[PDB]
């Protein structure tokens, strides 16, 4: 069933979009390009604190009628970081600032075989939340996170 959503921009501006629950995130970001002029691969859509990811759909994030999305600049550029288990060995990961902490765990599970529900990442004495990105924590390049455990 058709649906209206609202996208607030950093420039004190709220855009109305005509969408469907089946619409993919990339399909929505394209609509935002036509209206706001921002390249899809540079848009970071936020909802309830969760980053809407490409390949998914609005329904996957339970986006209901008249929901409000926030648009910010998706920070781009490949770089490497390090993850040292508290034991501990160190592995090197190729990431972008816009990669979520949940994404980082999936990459750790890919080479260390560690299930995400067992992974707890630390940096600067803080616990990194799955929903947020590396950017949100100012994780510099060459930084070393601490996996627990």
């Amino acid at each position, epitope marked *: 069933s058709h649906m209206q959503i609202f996208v607030k921009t950093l420039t004190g501006k709220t855009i109305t979009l005509e969408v469907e629950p089946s619409d993919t995130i990339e399909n929505v970001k394209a609509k935002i390009q036509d209206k706001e002029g921002i390249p899809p691969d540079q848009q970071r859509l936020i909802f309830a604190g969760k980053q809407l990811e490409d390949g998914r759909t609005l329904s996957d994030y339970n986006i209901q009628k008249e929901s409000t999305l926030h648009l910010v*600049l998706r920070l781009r550029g490949g770089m490497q970081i390090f993850v040292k288990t508290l034991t501990g060995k160190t592995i090197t990961l190729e990431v972008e*600032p816009s990669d979520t902490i949940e994404n980082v765990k999936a990459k750790i599970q890919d080479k260390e075989g560690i299930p995400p529900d067992q992974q707890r990442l630390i940096f600067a004495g803080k616990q990194l939340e799955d929903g947020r990105t590396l*950017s949100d924590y100012n994780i510099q390049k060459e930084s070393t996170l601490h996996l627990v455990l």
Partner: antibody
Amino acid sequence: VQLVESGGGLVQPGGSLRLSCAASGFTFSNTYISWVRQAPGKGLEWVASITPSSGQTDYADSVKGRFTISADTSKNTAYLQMNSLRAEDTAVYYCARTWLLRWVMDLWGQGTLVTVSS
Amino acid sequence: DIQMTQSPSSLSASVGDRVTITCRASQDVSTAVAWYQQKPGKAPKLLIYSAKFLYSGVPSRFSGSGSGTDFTLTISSLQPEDFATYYCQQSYTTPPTFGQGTKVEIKR
């Protein structure tokens, strides 16, 4: 909402100098910060950019090697360390904010004059 | 480096006139072009981005067009405050590059 610059002034050839670019009303979260200079009677030239929240950097060839762009995320302030300065480094230095799309400067600071002379 | 060539380097016009500046890229840059306005002793301001998208706070008399290598900045009705220097820029690739500038002066 603006960018406030300082640190500019008078320095001799081969000398060093540091510029500061303090943010007001906005944070460096989800932004690139750039330095653009303007020589007297000249146009605009991009000096360097940075992703404050990752420390990633980019420099123009005519300056890549002598200058260093850094940021203090804690205080939403960007810096520009200028070493081995030259007469042709004389210009007005702007710091600009990008938060819409890469390389587009949606906010420019007041400006600070850098002059390299004996 | 991608070269951005503006034309003309200077143009004279009177208030209320319709003005059009052209920007040429040395190669294809799709719609990744931005326009800035600057004034003596002042910092530049963003006017147009992604070729034809108006930035916040910018009068609707400013308009952008074009894609590829040929772009244009149009001012529907020149106003006393519109008399300044205009720079185009490509945000298509690194390093970002500006045009030489086009100064719009008053006619008399």
